[PDB]
């Protein structure tokens, strides 16, 4: 694959990820889909990134978020894209932490 | 819901000067909404808009109406909403309609493009379902 | 086959087919039978017209008519021929549109 | 309905100067009405007018009457019309008669022309039944 | 076989056969047996007559008679022979038309 | 019933100057009535009268009496009439007697002329039964 | 075997045999045993007679007597010998006919 | 009954100066009575008297007695009469005694002369039973 | 085996054996054991005496005594020796005939 | 109980300057308490501290907290103690936690070091159970 | 009364059957004629009975 | 009532079917037009009733 | 009253069997004749009975 | 009396979720701040009630 | 009363069995003799009983 | 009963100058009493006394006592008396004890001398049982 | 294994072992553990000792101790080490005789 | 009244176990001595109880 998707049960968990994640330094783009009040985070890597660096990054995500319960195909149709290309930076800009 | 797919069907029929709006125009409609589950699924079977146009053109005045079978396809898609998506019938339910109502022009466009109909149903169901089994 | 045969539940559906259809331009002759207050439409294709152009034409008909529930053998015996050779044109001559 | 097949079964026998109207004259009566289901079915098995005539010829006065078995064939054909379908007899029911009452001249003509009895029954039933199954 | 046997339920059916049969022109002798108030008719062909001319003749008989329900040995033992060699002619001579 | 099958046995015994009438004189009786079912059946096994005479001579008071087994086989033949033939024991019933009472001189003549007792029974039963079942 | 044994249910049946039997002229000895008020007749043929003339003679006996229901060894043990070597002649001397 | 056989046993024991009357003296007993079922049966296995005499000598005052097992054999033979005989206990019952009480001198002489003891039982039963079942 | 063992139900049976038996003249030694009010007699043959002379001698004993119901090792452990080497002679000297 | 595991986890996290205390920092915690059942089990599969460190390094401010899954791992380990003992949680239960909650960084360290999850479970169970079964 | 004839039918029929069994064909033929006439007469009585209802 | 026209529609419809079975297409067309008018009139009454409900 | 002979028949028959068991053939023969005579007398009484019936 | 507060939490929660769905992150952030303050006021009432019991 | 001796038989039996178990064959032989005499006396009483019966 | 084997066990331990009465001193005790069932059984497996002595020496102060398992063995042998010999107990039951309590120095000697426990038990049981099956 | 572990149900049984064992003279170290008030004794043999001499030594221990019901790794984790290297000597020094 | 020992001796046992768990072997040995003395005192009371019946 080139794409990974994880489900965040609430905005607080996304803010947790935005502050406390230390992601593997990798070339990728990200998107924040939302439906039904649930947040879905998706990352699309460059074609040159190997599948195992992707699996590593994906497993680092699972520390904070669940595996997705909706396919990419479904989300690209039904879900509102809230933010794009630099989700974590945008979150950390708009949301402070205590 | 992407009701726009019907507007595409009607506009394509008008563009081709047909006296009727039929299951071929529904199918061309689905290819005009590439956001949709249906467009992705068909593209996953390598059914694609240009080939659909060529098949429809080779396969076949005033105001227009749906053919008596196209009407039934629409109503039947609102029966595929017994997957409990309720009022939000969508491109997936239209395509499941055409897959159940296996007659008329669309069913032959599928046969000409070699699509396995039961595999297409399974593919849609798998796209809708939770990928955690 | 040389022949295809489809059922119309009522005269209005035949009038629909007469106005709101245009076949693949093809060398054929047609016959309209009735039984049981129910209309049956048959088309006869010249032997040079291949099986698949016939399947094409047949699949266009199914947009309006049902598949037949009586064989050609049965209908040629029991069914009154109502019109021949120019069925659509005749219908459009005798009946106005909607 | 099919009463013509009887009406010229008599004429066939009378021209042949036979003193009886037998199951061979019923069979020739069916061949004389080529519109009929029975004629079409038999023709589909390549049973045909001239062949039947030449077999009846090699197998073979006052006014004529039905043979005691021809009477029973007619009555039995009306019993073959006692299905759920029963509104009238037709040429199919007479042929179903000759097929059930597998004796006498006509049943010999069938054997002498290699016709398979149960295959003919099936062919008629398929001709009557809805081809959508 | 050289011999064929058939059953007539009543004298009227034998009289019918005697007047209204037109048998295949064939070399044979015939016998009329009676038991149980019930008539049986037997035809014995010359040895030169082939099996199939015999079958053809037999099938012609079944237009009027039933197939026999008693074996030939049984009838030859128990049955009274009523008439011989010219059964049809003797009937048509003794009995007036139908 | 053709009692003549019995009412000859004295004459054969006197001709042979025997001093008893036994199951083989019954068998000769069956040969002496060629109308009979029994004669026809045994002839179908090629058990002709001349061979029976030969074997009876080979195996073998003025007034004469039945042997105790001949008496029994007659009364057993009247038991075979409990195949619903009232008291009209025919030649077939006597033969079914000798077939059931498989002892004494008759049973030797059968074994010595290679008659299969069960096939003889079957042949008689088939001769009596309806040939079209 | 060379020894034939048959059972006579009563003295009258033995007398019947002694008068009415016409045995095959054969070289043998005979013995008459009794047990249980019931008579057993036994014949001991010469070795030079063949087995089938023995079976023949035996089968002629069955016209009058039953087949034996006791073995020869049993009778030679328990049964009283009544008469020997010329049983029929002795019977016919002692007893008048029927 | 066979009491003559015991009268033999005493005399053989006295002749051989034995101080006991054992199962071997019963077995030698039986051989003076060739009338007996037992003597015939043993002779049918070729167990003739001269052989038994030699074996009993190889296996080997005045006021003699039956051995404690000979007594047991006699009692047991009267139990074999529970084959619904009255108390007339023939040579066969004694032999069935020795066959069931398979110990002691006689039971060894049987093994020494290769007698199949169960076949001997069967042979005695077949000698007693109705030979035509 | 070198050794044979038999059970005597009572002293009277042993006295019977001692008076009335005469053995096969053989080289052997004998022992008399007691347990449970019950007598066990045992014979030890010389090694040169063959298995079958032993089986003969054993089978003579069964005329007076039962087969043993206890093993050699059991009796050698638990059973009291009553007499040795000349058991019959000792018995016949100590006890009179009945 | 060896709560010291968590102290080691936090100290390693701080030493690595990572802003979170995750399942890998737990796993590094276990490898720093070599008394523990967990360390012995992992060492028996030839997983060892230096290998774990180099895997965590290739897999990967101020006050810091457990990751949302690490919290669930701890709660799940207590649920294992509440099955086996109800008595105190220990290193074996933390390891059983990581073995059941098969997601996150630790699960990938196990996959990189080829450890069979079910075999590790079995090994822990057999370490706890009575070796006499 | 209509039901007065069938006994005569059975009588004449059985007489015919016996006569033909006796090979008295000329007599059996006249008996057949009688049976036929009586049958026609019985059918006419039945026709009267039909018209009576 | 309202319920006065459906039976007339049935009548005209059956007459239409008979006329076309007779191949009287010029008559059948006018019958079909009448049926359409009656259908429209029935629908208008049905919608008046829908509002009167 | 008929039933006065069959017991005598039994007696004579039993004596006959005993006599022939003794090989007393001449006595058995005379007893057999007597048995036959009494059997005929019993059949005569049975005929009187049959005719009185 | 904590039961006065709970529904106020849900009001702000839903408003926040709508605001972020509108991509109004400024409003969503302020709503989150309010939600947090209300959460602490809720826990204040909660642990006060715990201690009062 | 006859039923007076069997217990003495049992006594002598047990004494005999003990004596012979002691290898005291002299005593065992005399005890056997006594038992035999008592057995004869018991049988004699049993015969007197049988004859009184 | 052979309580002497316990005296032998103690006296052997004394001459060996050991400080305990163990299961091997019991086993030697059994070898000292060659009349016993147990000695005969072990001899039948060729477990000769001298080999037992040599193995015990190879394998291995004041007043002295049974080891806790020697006590266990004795008590368990008095439970093998539940074969209902429990009017007494004997060498056979001690050896069944050492078999059933399959641990300690005795069981080592048995494994070292290849003695199959199941065969030993079967041999003892057969030695006790009635050889007439 | 190179190490052996056995269970003592009570201090008295350990004292018994300490006084009354005469162990195979062997090069090893020992450790005494306790859990649950229940003692466990463990022995660590030198590598030059063979595994069969180890088994022999172990089977001497079974005379006093039970076989262990807890694994080495469990005891090394949870169990308090009470004594080391000279367990028997230390016990026999601290405690008087049985 | 015997049972007054059982609690004290069990207390001593528990204290012995604790002392040896503390590696206080010298103290645990004195606890063992006390335990043994109480064991014999129990046995004395148990002998009195036995001999009283």
PDB file of N, CA and C in Angstrom, chain M residues 3-53:
ATOM      1  N   UNK M   3     -69.667 -95.555  21.267  1.00  0.00           N
ATOM      2  CA  UNK M   3     -68.260 -95.419  21.625  1.00  0.00           C
ATOM      3  C   UNK M   3     -67.722 -96.548  22.500  1.00  0.00           C
ATOM      4  N   UNK M   4     -68.001 -97.788  22.106  1.00  0.00           N
ATOM      5  CA  UNK M   4     -67.722 -98.965  22.913  1.00  0.00           C
ATOM      6  C   UNK M   4     -66.685 -99.876  22.271  1.00  0.00           C
ATOM      7  N   UNK M   5     -66.189 -99.525  21.087  1.00  0.00           N
ATOM      8  CA  UNK M   5     -65.304-100.384  20.320  1.00  0.00           C
ATOM      9  C   UNK M   5     -63.884 -99.832  20.249  1.00  0.00           C
ATOM     10  N   UNK M   6     -63.732 -98.512  20.215  1.00  0.00           N
ATOM     11  CA  UNK M   6     -62.445 -97.886  19.942  1.00  0.00           C
ATOM     12  C   UNK M   6     -61.423 -98.230  21.012  1.00  0.00           C
ATOM     13  N   UNK M   7     -61.871 -98.351  22.256  1.00  0.00           N
ATOM     14  CA  UNK M   7     -61.005 -98.828  23.324  1.00  0.00           C
ATOM     15  C   UNK M   7     -60.616-100.288  23.129  1.00  0.00           C
ATOM     16  N   UNK M   8     -61.518-101.098  22.582  1.00  0.00           N
ATOM     17  CA  UNK M   8     -61.174-102.477  22.261  1.00  0.00           C
ATOM     18  C   UNK M   8     -60.229-102.537  21.071  1.00  0.00           C
ATOM     19  N   UNK M   9     -60.450-101.667  20.088  1.00  0.00           N
ATOM     20  CA  UNK M   9     -59.500-101.501  18.994  1.00  0.00           C
ATOM     21  C   UNK M   9     -58.116-101.149  19.523  1.00  0.00           C
ATOM     22  N   UNK M  10     -58.040-100.185  20.436  1.00  0.00           N
ATOM     23  CA  UNK M  10     -56.759 -99.839  21.039  1.00  0.00           C
ATOM     24  C   UNK M  10     -56.120-101.030  21.734  1.00  0.00           C
ATOM     25  N   UNK M  11     -56.881-101.722  22.578  1.00  0.00           N
ATOM     26  CA  UNK M  11     -56.360-102.905  23.255  1.00  0.00           C
ATOM     27  C   UNK M  11     -55.771-103.906  22.271  1.00  0.00           C
ATOM     28  N   UNK M  12     -56.543-104.267  21.249  1.00  0.00           N
ATOM     29  CA  UNK M  12     -56.088-105.254  20.277  1.00  0.00           C
ATOM     30  C   UNK M  12     -54.870-104.758  19.516  1.00  0.00           C
ATOM     31  N   UNK M  13     -54.883-103.499  19.090  1.00  0.00           N
ATOM     32  CA  UNK M  13     -53.748-102.938  18.367  1.00  0.00           C
ATOM     33  C   UNK M  13     -52.486-102.924  19.217  1.00  0.00           C
ATOM     34  N   UNK M  14     -52.615-102.524  20.475  1.00  0.00           N
ATOM     35  CA  UNK M  14     -51.476-102.516  21.376  1.00  0.00           C
ATOM     36  C   UNK M  14     -50.934-103.922  21.578  1.00  0.00           C
ATOM     37  N   UNK M  15     -51.830-104.892  21.752  1.00  0.00           N
ATOM     38  CA  UNK M  15     -51.411-106.283  21.856  1.00  0.00           C
ATOM     39  C   UNK M  15     -50.721-106.754  20.588  1.00  0.00           C
ATOM     40  N   UNK M  16     -51.224-106.335  19.434  1.00  0.00           N
ATOM     41  CA  UNK M  16     -50.590-106.667  18.165  1.00  0.00           C
ATOM     42  C   UNK M  16     -49.158-106.155  18.114  1.00  0.00           C
ATOM     43  N   UNK M  17     -48.970-104.882  18.443  1.00  0.00           N
ATOM     44  CA  UNK M  17     -47.626-104.319  18.474  1.00  0.00           C
ATOM     45  C   UNK M  17     -46.723-105.075  19.437  1.00  0.00           C
ATOM     46  N   UNK M  18     -47.219-105.373  20.632  1.00  0.00           N
ATOM     47  CA  UNK M  18     -46.428-106.159  21.573  1.00  0.00           C
ATOM     48  C   UNK M  18     -46.088-107.543  21.032  1.00  0.00           C
ATOM     49  N   UNK M  19     -47.046-108.197  20.384  1.00  0.00           N
ATOM     50  CA  UNK M  19     -46.825-109.533  19.846  1.00  0.00           C
ATOM     51  C   UNK M  19     -45.757-109.537  18.768  1.00  0.00           C
ATOM     52  N   UNK M  20     -45.829-108.588  17.841  1.00  0.00           N
ATOM     53  CA  UNK M  20     -44.796-108.535  16.818  1.00  0.00           C
ATOM     54  C   UNK M  20     -43.462-108.102  17.406  1.00  0.00           C
ATOM     55  N   UNK M  21     -43.478-107.274  18.447  1.00  0.00           N
ATOM     56  CA  UNK M  21     -42.243-107.003  19.170  1.00  0.00           C
ATOM     57  C   UNK M  21     -41.663-108.267  19.774  1.00  0.00           C
ATOM     58  N   UNK M  22     -42.517-109.186  20.195  1.00  0.00           N
ATOM     59  CA  UNK M  22     -42.079-110.503  20.625  1.00  0.00           C
ATOM     60  C   UNK M  22     -41.741-111.436  19.473  1.00  0.00           C
ATOM     61  N   UNK M  23     -41.784-110.967  18.230  1.00  0.00           N
ATOM     62  CA  UNK M  23     -41.664-111.820  17.049  1.00  0.00           C
ATOM     63  C   UNK M  23     -42.725-112.915  16.993  1.00  0.00           C
ATOM     64  N   UNK M  24     -43.840-112.734  17.696  1.00  0.00           N
ATOM     65  CA  UNK M  24     -44.953-113.684  17.676  1.00  0.00           C
ATOM     66  C   UNK M  24     -45.878-113.415  16.485  1.00  0.00           C
ATOM     67  N   UNK M  25     -45.323-113.623  15.290  1.00  0.00           N
ATOM     68  CA  UNK M  25     -45.988-113.203  14.060  1.00  0.00           C
ATOM     69  C   UNK M  25     -47.358-113.838  13.869  1.00  0.00           C
ATOM     70  N   UNK M  26     -47.523-115.117  14.196  1.00  0.00           N
ATOM     71  CA  UNK M  26     -48.840-115.722  14.004  1.00  0.00           C
ATOM     72  C   UNK M  26     -49.892-115.111  14.920  1.00  0.00           C
ATOM     73  N   UNK M  27     -49.522-114.844  16.167  1.00  0.00           N
ATOM     74  CA  UNK M  27     -50.427-114.147  17.066  1.00  0.00           C
ATOM     75  C   UNK M  27     -50.687-112.728  16.600  1.00  0.00           C
ATOM     76  N   UNK M  28     -49.644-112.028  16.167  1.00  0.00           N
ATOM     77  CA  UNK M  28     -49.834-110.700  15.601  1.00  0.00           C
ATOM     78  C   UNK M  28     -50.771-110.721  14.403  1.00  0.00           C
ATOM     79  N   UNK M  29     -50.642-111.720  13.536  1.00  0.00           N
ATOM     80  CA  UNK M  29     -51.511-111.835  12.370  1.00  0.00           C
ATOM     81  C   UNK M  29     -52.966-112.040  12.760  1.00  0.00           C
ATOM     82  N   UNK M  30     -53.212-112.922  13.720  1.00  0.00           N
ATOM     83  CA  UNK M  30     -54.581-113.115  14.182  1.00  0.00           C
ATOM     84  C   UNK M  30     -55.123-111.879  14.887  1.00  0.00           C
ATOM     85  N   UNK M  31     -54.287-111.200  15.662  1.00  0.00           N
ATOM     86  CA  UNK M  31     -54.699-109.942  16.268  1.00  0.00           C
ATOM     87  C   UNK M  31     -54.991-108.882  15.217  1.00  0.00           C
ATOM     88  N   UNK M  32     -54.201-108.849  14.153  1.00  0.00           N
ATOM     89  CA  UNK M  32     -54.432-107.922  13.053  1.00  0.00           C
ATOM     90  C   UNK M  32     -55.755-108.197  12.362  1.00  0.00           C
ATOM     91  N   UNK M  33     -56.063-109.469  12.141  1.00  0.00           N
ATOM     92  CA  UNK M  33     -57.370-109.833  11.610  1.00  0.00           C
ATOM     93  C   UNK M  33     -58.492-109.393  12.538  1.00  0.00           C
ATOM     94  N   UNK M  34     -58.344-109.654  13.834  1.00  0.00           N
ATOM     95  CA  UNK M  34     -59.340-109.205  14.800  1.00  0.00           C
ATOM     96  C   UNK M  34     -59.511-107.694  14.767  1.00  0.00           C
ATOM     97  N   UNK M  35     -58.401-106.963  14.761  1.00  0.00           N
ATOM     98  CA  UNK M  35     -58.453-105.514  14.651  1.00  0.00           C
ATOM     99  C   UNK M  35     -59.246-105.100  13.424  1.00  0.00           C
ATOM    100  N   UNK M  36     -58.949-105.710  12.278  1.00  0.00           N
ATOM    101  CA  UNK M  36     -59.666-105.385  11.048  1.00  0.00           C
ATOM    102  C   UNK M  36     -61.157-105.662  11.182  1.00  0.00           C
ATOM    103  N   UNK M  37     -61.499-106.790  11.794  1.00  0.00           N
ATOM    104  CA  UNK M  37     -62.893-107.164  12.002  1.00  0.00           C
ATOM    105  C   UNK M  37     -63.617-106.139  12.862  1.00  0.00           C
ATOM    106  N   UNK M  38     -62.997-105.753  13.968  1.00  0.00           N
ATOM    107  CA  UNK M  38     -63.581-104.750  14.844  1.00  0.00           C
ATOM    108  C   UNK M  38     -63.603-103.381  14.189  1.00  0.00           C
ATOM    109  N   UNK M  39     -62.642-103.097  13.322  1.00  0.00           N
ATOM    110  CA  UNK M  39     -62.647-101.842  12.587  1.00  0.00           C
ATOM    111  C   UNK M  39     -63.831-101.783  11.639  1.00  0.00           C
ATOM    112  N   UNK M  40     -64.093-102.888  10.947  1.00  0.00           N
ATOM    113  CA  UNK M  40     -65.279-102.991  10.108  1.00  0.00           C
ATOM    114  C   UNK M  40     -66.554-102.854  10.926  1.00  0.00           C
ATOM    115  N   UNK M  41     -66.586-103.457  12.109  1.00  0.00           N
ATOM    116  CA  UNK M  41     -67.748-103.329  12.984  1.00  0.00           C
ATOM    117  C   UNK M  41     -67.946-101.899  13.476  1.00  0.00           C
ATOM    118  N   UNK M  42     -66.856-101.212  13.799  1.00  0.00           N
ATOM    119  CA  UNK M  42     -66.924 -99.795  14.126  1.00  0.00           C
ATOM    120  C   UNK M  42     -67.411 -98.960  12.955  1.00  0.00           C
ATOM    121  N   UNK M  43     -66.925 -99.242  11.752  1.00  0.00           N
ATOM    122  CA  UNK M  43     -67.424 -98.538  10.576  1.00  0.00           C
ATOM    123  C   UNK M  43     -68.896 -98.828  10.318  1.00  0.00           C
ATOM    124  N   UNK M  44     -69.340-100.050  10.590  1.00  0.00           N
ATOM    125  CA  UNK M  44     -70.764-100.360  10.519  1.00  0.00           C
ATOM    126  C   UNK M  44     -71.567 -99.527  11.511  1.00  0.00           C
ATOM    127  N   UNK M  45     -71.100 -99.452  12.755  1.00  0.00           N
ATOM    128  CA  UNK M  45     -71.762 -98.602  13.739  1.00  0.00           C
ATOM    129  C   UNK M  45     -71.737 -97.139  13.319  1.00  0.00           C
ATOM    130  N   UNK M  46     -70.623 -96.694  12.746  1.00  0.00           N
ATOM    131  CA  UNK M  46     -70.510 -95.342  12.217  1.00  0.00           C
ATOM    132  C   UNK M  46     -71.449 -95.093  11.048  1.00  0.00           C
ATOM    133  N   UNK M  47     -71.732 -96.119  10.255  1.00  0.00           N
ATOM    134  CA  UNK M  47     -72.735 -95.996   9.204  1.00  0.00           C
ATOM    135  C   UNK M  47     -74.148 -95.939   9.768  1.00  0.00           C
ATOM    136  N   UNK M  48     -74.439 -96.751  10.781  1.00  0.00           N
ATOM    137  CA  UNK M  48     -75.713 -96.629  11.484  1.00  0.00           C
ATOM    138  C   UNK M  48     -75.885 -95.227  12.054  1.00  0.00           C
ATOM    139  N   UNK M  49     -74.831 -94.702  12.672  1.00  0.00           N
ATOM    140  CA  UNK M  49     -74.823 -93.332  13.173  1.00  0.00           C
ATOM    141  C   UNK M  49     -75.065 -92.322  12.054  1.00  0.00           C
ATOM    142  N   UNK M  50     -74.304 -92.437  10.965  1.00  0.00           N
ATOM    143  CA  UNK M  50     -74.459 -91.571   9.799  1.00  0.00           C
ATOM    144  C   UNK M  50     -75.879 -91.585   9.250  1.00  0.00           C
ATOM    145  N   UNK M  51     -76.512 -92.753   9.223  1.00  0.00           N
ATOM    146  CA  UNK M  51     -77.859 -92.860   8.683  1.00  0.00           C
ATOM    147  C   UNK M  51     -78.913 -92.399   9.678  1.00  0.00           C
ATOM    148  N   UNK M  52     -78.645 -92.551  10.974  1.00  0.00           N
ATOM    149  CA  UNK M  52     -79.523 -91.990  11.990  1.00  0.00           C
ATOM    150  C   UNK M  52     -79.413 -90.475  12.043  1.00  0.00           C
ATOM    151  N   UNK M  53     -78.236 -89.937  11.754  1.00  0.00           N
ATOM    152  CA  UNK M  53     -78.059 -88.500  11.596  1.00  0.00           C
ATOM    153  C   UNK M  53     -78.910 -87.946  10.456  1.00  0.00           C
TER     154      UNK M  53
END
